[PDB]
Design an enzyme around this catalytic site. Structure first.
Site, PDB file in Angstrom:
ATOM      1  N   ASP A 190     -25.536   1.260 -60.505  1.00 55.23           N
ATOM      2  CA  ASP A 190     -24.271   1.962 -60.687  1.00 55.23           C
ATOM      3  C   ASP A 190     -24.368   3.094 -61.698  1.00 55.23           C
ATOM      4  O   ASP A 190     -23.425   3.882 -61.809  1.00 55.23           O
ATOM      5  CB  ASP A 190     -23.193   0.963 -61.135  1.00 55.23           C
ATOM      6  CG  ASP A 190     -21.778   1.446 -60.865  1.00 55.23           C
ATOM      7  OD1 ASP A 190     -21.533   2.061 -59.801  1.00 55.23           O
ATOM      8  OD2 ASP A 190     -20.900   1.189 -61.720  1.00 55.23           O
ATOM      9  N   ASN A 229     -11.491 -13.538 -68.399  1.00 54.28           N
ATOM     10  CA  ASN A 229     -11.460 -12.451 -69.369  1.00 54.28           C
ATOM     11  C   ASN A 229     -10.022 -12.134 -69.770  1.00 54.28           C
ATOM     12  O   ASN A 229      -9.067 -12.520 -69.095  1.00 54.28           O
ATOM     13  CB  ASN A 229     -12.126 -11.200 -68.791  1.00 54.28           C
ATOM     14  CG  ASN A 229     -13.541 -11.463 -68.337  1.00 54.28           C
ATOM     15  OD1 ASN A 229     -13.902 -11.184 -67.190  1.00 54.28           O
ATOM     16  ND2 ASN A 229     -14.342 -12.037 -69.218  1.00 54.28           N
ATOM     17  N   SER A 238      -9.237 -10.738 -65.302  1.00 55.05           N
ATOM     18  CA  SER A 238     -10.346 -10.882 -64.387  1.00 55.05           C
ATOM     19  C   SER A 238     -11.153 -12.126 -64.759  1.00 55.05           C
ATOM     20  O   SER A 238     -10.959 -12.736 -65.808  1.00 55.05           O
ATOM     21  CB  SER A 238     -11.217  -9.631 -64.413  1.00 55.05           C
ATOM     22  OG  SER A 238     -11.800  -9.488 -65.695  1.00 55.05           O
ATOM     23  N   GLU A 254     -25.918 -15.404 -69.858  1.00 56.22           N
ATOM     24  CA  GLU A 254     -24.631 -15.271 -69.181  1.00 56.22           C
ATOM     25  C   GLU A 254     -24.091 -16.617 -68.719  1.00 56.22           C
ATOM     26  O   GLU A 254     -22.891 -16.879 -68.830  1.00 56.22           O
ATOM     27  CB  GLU A 254     -24.754 -14.336 -67.976  1.00 56.22           C
ATOM     28  CG  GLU A 254     -24.924 -12.860 -68.317  1.00 56.22           C
ATOM     29  CD  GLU A 254     -23.710 -12.243 -68.975  1.00 56.22           C
ATOM     30  OE1 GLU A 254     -22.617 -12.856 -68.956  1.00 56.22           O
ATOM     31  OE2 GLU A 254     -23.864 -11.134 -69.524  1.00 56.22           O
ATOM     32  N   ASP A 276      -8.362  -9.369 -69.687  1.00 56.01           N
ATOM     33  CA  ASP A 276      -7.610  -8.559 -68.734  1.00 56.01           C
ATOM     34  C   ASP A 276      -7.181  -9.337 -67.492  1.00 56.01           C
ATOM     35  O   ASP A 276      -6.591  -8.738 -66.585  1.00 56.01           O
ATOM     36  CB  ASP A 276      -8.419  -7.323 -68.328  1.00 56.01           C
ATOM     37  CG  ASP A 276      -9.682  -7.659 -67.546  1.00 56.01           C
ATOM     38  OD1 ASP A 276      -9.983  -8.849 -67.346  1.00 56.01           O
ATOM     39  OD2 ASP A 276     -10.388  -6.718 -67.134  1.00 56.01           O
TER      40      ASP A 276
END
Length: 129
Positions: free
Chosen positions: A101, A46, A50, A35, A48
């Site tokens: 999650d 990103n 974000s 990462e 979108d």
């Protein structure tokens, strides 16, 4: 800060990530390697709008507030800049909420594509843990 492999493994172990929700330490080190290349200051934008922050590239759409992801959530209740600290506590505490999650470590695309199903304990071999 750019961590060494074993240095990060020991920091993650101290913060309780070894076998957290069933994921062995090697999984977390592998995910951080791909990462962020172990760099706490990594950021990536990103499509979108974000942005992903820190050693585990935690995304501002859901997990932290960076003031520029409109309509996003802040589930870890932190400014995204807290995820860039040399102290990985904030990243780890937020990662623990992400991995709980329901989707496990599949939340990390690099883990899914580059760690899942590999010999992840290789990432902690040789380390004093």
């Amino acid at each position: 800060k750019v961590f060494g492999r074993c240095e990060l493994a020991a920091a993650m172990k101290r913060h309780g990530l070894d076998n957290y929700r069933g994921y062995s330490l090697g999984n977390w080190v592998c995910a951080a390697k791909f990462e962020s290349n172990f760099n706490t200051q990594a950021t990536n934008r990103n499509t979108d709008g974000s942005t992903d922050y820190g050693i585990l590239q935690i995304n501002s759409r859901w997990w932290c507030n960076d003031g520029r992801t409109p309509g996003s959530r802040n589930l870890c209740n932190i400014p995204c800049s807290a995820l860039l600290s040399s102290d990985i506590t904030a990243s780890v505490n937020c990662a623990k909420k992400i991995v709980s999650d329901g989707n496990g470590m599949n939340a990390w695309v690099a883990w899914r594509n580059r760690c899942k199903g590999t010999d992840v304990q290789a990432w902690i071999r040789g380390c004093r843990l």
